[PDB]
């Protein structure tokens, strides 16, 4: 590739980093340093209290929620020996999940997804992980995460997380994220179940608006889940010195889970295409029915007006005052042609 | 043979800027033979040929500077994409300038050719006016370090000015898209969707022009010819990232425009329903009435409907009754 240089964007100082995001409301740093027998946990807002955890024998977990503060992330990167380009990728939000291996750390970018039923908004939030020799750094974007089970496991000494190093912590965090992807998928299931009956019963503009926004949402889900699958494949097929061989079997389960997730996404895309077809069919059927009404009226009453005009023209030679002064046979002709048209329409099974 | 392909065939002028660390000479001439010995100056020089339709001047310039006629064909081939060709003598570059005006939402380009020879740069334009005015000001008034450097830095400055013009065009397109988003999400119409189509075509052309530009910059800084020389490579590395920014913005704009166009265009069958409902509710209540008029307009002698207790008001009352019941029935059908 290239030599891992800085971007040097335009209209901007040569060596500055810009937070490429929207959330600029909250900031906090939670440190959870756990060992075999005892642990510490605290939440502060000053970065000077979390740096001395770099040279910690016991595994520790430093969660910086809120990366709009470029000063704190820059200080953390300077202390922990993080490359400036890695910091730039940490702050840059508009990028797909990815994994990079370095000498002293492994740097991963993943994404959380929150589906709000109101307004049907699928929000994506980057979460970045850096696994160092002893400590795991997680940079979030805003308050709210899916690692509460991991925090409960660490606090309550549940599972085997308290007697394993930081690589198992990274595995647990990635596993929690992939597990929450399943909850996102089942929410998509429920919303699609809601959508289908509205599509096939109330075909209006909001229906196709929602359907197309959801097609875009599933395209985004595919585009963000395939790189996650590649990340996990590179994770369990490489085995950098940072992670030990005793944890590699744990990543295969996460890989299988992501395989299942990708299959579910493909099924979702197929269902979405079918649903759009259903909408088109229903709308065409409605216009076909109103069109039946129009063509029935036109077919029945066009030849009648034709023959009325035929017998209504001013010509000198009318064989008209014949067969009971003409009018009754004309009325009978109208009646017989009308009943013929009605019967023919009945033989076709509409009106 | 040399044939001009473009359509700008009304302007021609030669502009020469020979600048050193302490001296500068700028002039405008229309004689090809006067500017030829400028290769003798060890100091960098900048020759600008504004008119391509005068093929004699470019032919003579190629003859004197010794460039293989395929580059002449490429220069005169206006319909092209940005490209880079490397030779043991000179570097050939084809770029595209862009012009955008807010009133008439249309985009027009202008191919510009650059040839970098030993201590010399030649640029072939197509008409009066370009985007290299800041470079001219920097050379003339000794603002930056352009004088202290050779012609490679001059090529750098020209490409950088072109990229800044690309940024300005992107700002204009951003304003256009911001207007169009509300214009189509509030009051959709045929004119708005036509503007959306035009914007999509403009974005397609812009991306088709910007991707080869990124490739040209990559080839410019990655594998360095002796002409480029090391001291300019860190500068050429920046324009690649500028092109990265431009390409990312173009991709985002294209995605937004495509999404908006699809969102509008996926709602044609509802309009079909509306027009069918209108035509049906209008023609359903008038064909019976015209039929009744035809029945009562026949030329029948001794017809029963001669005079029956105000027959005309009775007939119009009957037709009004049937029209009223038919129009009421359609409301029951939600039409």
């Amino acid at each position, epitope marked *: 590739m290239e030599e891992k240089r800085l971007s040097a964007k335009k209209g901007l100082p040569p060596g500055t980093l810009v937070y490429t995001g929207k959330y600029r409301e909250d900031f906090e740093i939670e440190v959870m340093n756990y060992s075999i027998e005892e642990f510490r946990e605290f939440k502060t807002t000053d970065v000077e209290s979390v740096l001395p955890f770099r040279d910690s024998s016991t595994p520790t977990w430093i969660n910086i929620t809120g990366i709009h503060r470029t000063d704190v992330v820059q200080r953390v990167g300077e202390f922990f020996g993080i490359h400036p380009l890695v910091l730039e990728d940490i702050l840059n939000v*508009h990028q797909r999940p990815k994994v990079e291996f370095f000498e002293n750390y492994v740097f991963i970018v993943l994404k959380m997804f929150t589906y709000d039923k109101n307004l049907h908004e699928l929000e994506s939030e980057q979460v970045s992980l850096i696994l160092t020799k002893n400590c795991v750094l997680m940079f979030q974007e805003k308050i709210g995460d899916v690692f509460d089970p991991v925090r409960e496991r660490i606090r309550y000494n549940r599972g085997i997380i308290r007697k394993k190093r930081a690589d198992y912590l990274l595995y647990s965090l990635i596993d929690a994220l992939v597990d929450d992807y399943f909850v996102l998928l089942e929410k998509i299931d429920d919303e699609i179940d809601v959508l289908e009956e509205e599509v096939l019963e109330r075909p209006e503009k909001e229906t196709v608006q929602r359907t197309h926004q959801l097609k875009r949402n599933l395209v985004e889900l595919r585009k963000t889940i395939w790189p996650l699958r590649e990340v996990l494949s590179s994770l369990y097929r490489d085995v950098p010195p940072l992670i030990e061989k005793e944890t590699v079997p744990y990543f295969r389960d996460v890989y299988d889970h992501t395989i299942q997730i990708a299959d579910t996404v493909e099924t979702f895309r197929d269902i979405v295409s079918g649903l759009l077809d259903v909408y088109l069919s229903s709308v065409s059927n409605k216009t076909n029915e109103v069109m039946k009404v129009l063509t029935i009226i036109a077919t029945i009453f066009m030849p009648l007006t034709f023959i009325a005009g035929i017998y209504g023209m001013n010509f000198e030679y009318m064989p008209e005052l014949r067969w009971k002064w003409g009018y009754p046979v004309v009325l009978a002709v109208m009646g017989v042609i009308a009943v013929i048209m009605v019967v023919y329409f009945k033989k076709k099974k509409w009106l | 043979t040399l044939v001009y392909t473009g359509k700008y065939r009304e302007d021609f002028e030669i502009e020469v800027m020979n600048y050193s660390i302490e001296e500068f000479r700028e002039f405008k001439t229309t004689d090809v033979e006067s500017v030829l010995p400028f290769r003798d100056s060890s100091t960098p020089t900048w020759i600008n040929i504004t008119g391509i339709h005068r093929t004699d001047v470019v032919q003579r310039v190629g003859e004197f500077f010794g460039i293989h006629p395929l580059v002449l064909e490429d220069i005169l081939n206006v319909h092209q994409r940005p490209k880079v060709e490397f030779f043991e003598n000179y570097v050939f570059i084809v770029l595209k300038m862009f012009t955008y005006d807010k009133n008439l939402h249309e985009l027009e380009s202008e191919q510009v050719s650059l040839i970098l020879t030993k201590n010399c740069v030649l640029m072939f334009q197509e008409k009066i006016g370009d985007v290299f005015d800041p470079v001219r000001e920097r050379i003339r008034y000794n603002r930056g370090i352009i004088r202290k450097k050779r012609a490679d830095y001059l090529l750098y400055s020209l490409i950088d000015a072109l990229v800044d013009d690309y940024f300005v065009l992107l700002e204009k397109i951003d304003d256009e898209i911001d207007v169009l988003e509300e214009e189509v999400l509030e009051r959709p119409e045929k004119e708005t969707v036509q503007r959306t189509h035009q914007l999509k075509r403009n974005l397609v052309e812009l991306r088709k022009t910007i991707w080869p530009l990124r490739e040209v910059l990559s080839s410019l800084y990655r594998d360095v010819p002796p002409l480029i020389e090391k001291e300019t490579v860190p500068y050429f590395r920046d324009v690649y990232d500028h092109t990265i920014q431009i390409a990312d*913005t173009v991709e985002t704009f294209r995605d937004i425009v495509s999404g908006l166009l699809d969102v509008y265009l996926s709602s044609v069958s509802n309009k079909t329903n509306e027009v069918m409902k209108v035509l049906t509710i209008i023609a359903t209540i008038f064909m019976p009435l015209t039929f009744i008029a035809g029945i009562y307009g026949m030329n029948f002698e001794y017809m029963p409907e001669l005079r029956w207790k105000w027959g005309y008001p009775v007939v119009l009352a009957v037709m009004g009754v049937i029209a009223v019941i038919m129009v009421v029935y359609f409301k029951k059908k939600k039409w």
Partner: antibody
Amino acid sequence: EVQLVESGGGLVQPGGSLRLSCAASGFNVSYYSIHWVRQAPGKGLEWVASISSSSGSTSYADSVKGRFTISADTSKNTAYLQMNSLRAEDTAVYYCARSYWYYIWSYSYGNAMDYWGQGTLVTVSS
Amino acid sequence: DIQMTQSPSSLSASVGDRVTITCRASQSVSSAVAWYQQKPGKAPKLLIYSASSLYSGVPSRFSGSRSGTDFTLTISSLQPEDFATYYCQQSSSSLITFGQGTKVEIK
């Protein structure tokens, strides 16, 4: 926690140079831009200068270009503005603001000033 | 440079009504417009950045909208604490410029 405090304002004769110091407390000046904003008495806000301490890249308004000078000292966490050849209309209150870059598109960025200083009044007369 | 013409130059409105102030850029700015509020005799307080987003720590009544080069600030329901001078600022270029201000009075 973050505080911006200016100093150095006072009466100066025309053509006399005085330095305005913007002491920065609660943050590191190296990670943020520092902008000076001049407000004439009874007039609207006007931008005058800017500085990026990380790279030492300055930006001056056309009204003070080549006459003023802005410098930032990361060691003492302070940004200094030097106003040589001070003229008559420069009499105004000077605000020091810390700005942060935000992202709009891949090609466009903008800066917004979170915290402003108290503002020191500079008077040029007599 | 870029001139940011702000209108109206002075607005009068009581408490509880919607107030709209507009500023027009001379040329294109890519939504890099911020809105600041200054009480008489105090430092300005930032309200709007990116011409739509809301700064963290201001009432939600303030809103920002953009249409081409027209940037509008709207207060949905005024309060006695919202009678100050409002300034636009374009930051697309390195040389940033301010609006001339819009003092909001009472009736």
